[PDB]
Every structure is written in C-alpha cells, then in structure tokens.
Amino acid sequence: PGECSVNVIPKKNLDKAKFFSGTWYVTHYLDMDPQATEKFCFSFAPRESGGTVKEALYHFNVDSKVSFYNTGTGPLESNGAKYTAKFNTVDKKGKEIKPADEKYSYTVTVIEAAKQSALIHICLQEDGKDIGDLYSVLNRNKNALPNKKIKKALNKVSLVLTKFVVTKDLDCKYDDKFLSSWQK
C-alpha cells in the first residue's frame, strides 16, 4: 500500500559534522507514489548533537504557491546515518504554529554523501506504520548536478536519475534565511 522501500542502506561512516551543517537543497526527487504529481521544492538545515538530530525543513508547493515550515527532532541511530523524527509546524520566524502530532514521524536515511552532494531517503509513518516514501538527491548548490557516487548509490538499488523530478527547472521560491539562521 503505502509501504516504504526496502534496501535503503545507511552510509557507512557518514561524516556527521559535515552532513549535519549548512543548508541542503533537493535538486532531484522521486516520490515512490506515481500519483504524487504536485511539483515541489525543498531545502533543510539538519543539525546533530549528543545523538539527537534537530532540523529545520522548508517545502514549497509550486502548484499552489504555498510554502510550509517544520522542525523535526529525533534520535540518531547507532549507525550514524539514519534518524527518526517527530515534527511540528512553525512560521517563517520559527515560532510554533502547530504542535507535533505524536502519531506522525518520519525516518531519514542518508544513503550516500560525496563532495557537495548527498542521497537521502525519507519514510513517513503514522502510528509506526509506513504511509509513503521519497528519495531526494541533495546539493549545496540548487543548480548543480549530483556527484557520480550518488548515481552509483541509486543504481545499486535499481533507480535511475532520469526518473527523478528536476527542481532547478521549477519556479522554486526558497526561504534561505529561515534555514541559514537555524539555531543561531
């Protein structure tokens, strides 16, 4: 049904300080539900300390011209490249406008990271049950193409980059200040 992908392997020895810093843009995404066809842009600022991830998330619905802001918090797994977060909703000023709903969570796996690129996978859940998943290619630069290591990781799990939505070809609007000021 809304089952999350299997064979999502956490990167071995992810450099935490490097990955959990700055702002990441999704340059390419693949929603595993083929009927999910609203076009989006996304960026986020993940941070980690003492085995807990605290990240700020930014989505922009290109179809509707509406953005939404969330923050997520959760424990990093012992592998160091996978975490499950509970999330709330905040405004552009970072003030909570909707509390976290305990029944919802998401699990991020960092599959690969190389140079200025990364590949992540996100499984959304409700009551610990899968409700949908998506792969995202990340880059520090909105307009950049992914490192070959990222394509190799995609190919290991039988995905090809051409199937992904390219965000640079979308009319994205980003709130970069929300992310750059994260935890300042």
* Residues that constitute the known binding site for heme: 59, 70
Binding of ligand HEM at residue 54 (CB under 6 A)?
no
Q: Which element (helix H / strand E) includes 80?
A: none
Query: Nearer Cβ to ligand HEM, position 19 or 44?
Result: 44
Q: Cβ 152 to ligand HEM, closest distance in Å?
A: 21
What torsion do the CA atoms of 104, 184, 12, 5 make, to the nearest 10 degrees?
30
Query: Nearer Cβ to ligand HEM, position 81 or 122?
Result: 122
The CA-atom distances, in angstroms, between 47 and each of 27, 36, 154, 165 are 20, 29, 25, 26
**DSSP SS3 for 155:** helix
**Contacts of residue 101, Cβ cutoff 8 Å, sequence gap at least 6:** none
DSSP string, 49-70: ETTEEEEEEEEEETTTTEEEEE
Binding of ligand HEM at residue 59 (CB under 6 A)?
yes
Annotated binding-site positions: 31, 59, 70, 133
Could you say which of 122, 123, 153, 179 contacts ligand HEM (CB under 6 A)?
122
Binding of ligand HEM at residue 89 (CB under 6 A)?
yes
DSSP β-bridge partners for residue 96:
90
- Residues 16-35 contacting ligand HEM, CB under 6 A: 26, 29, 31
Q: Cβ 78 to ligand HEM, closest distance in Å?
A: 20
What does the binding site for ligand HEM look like in residue numbers (CB under 6 A)?
Answer: 26, 29, 31, 36, 38, 40, 42, 44, 57, 59, 70, 87, 89, 106, 108, 122, 134, 136
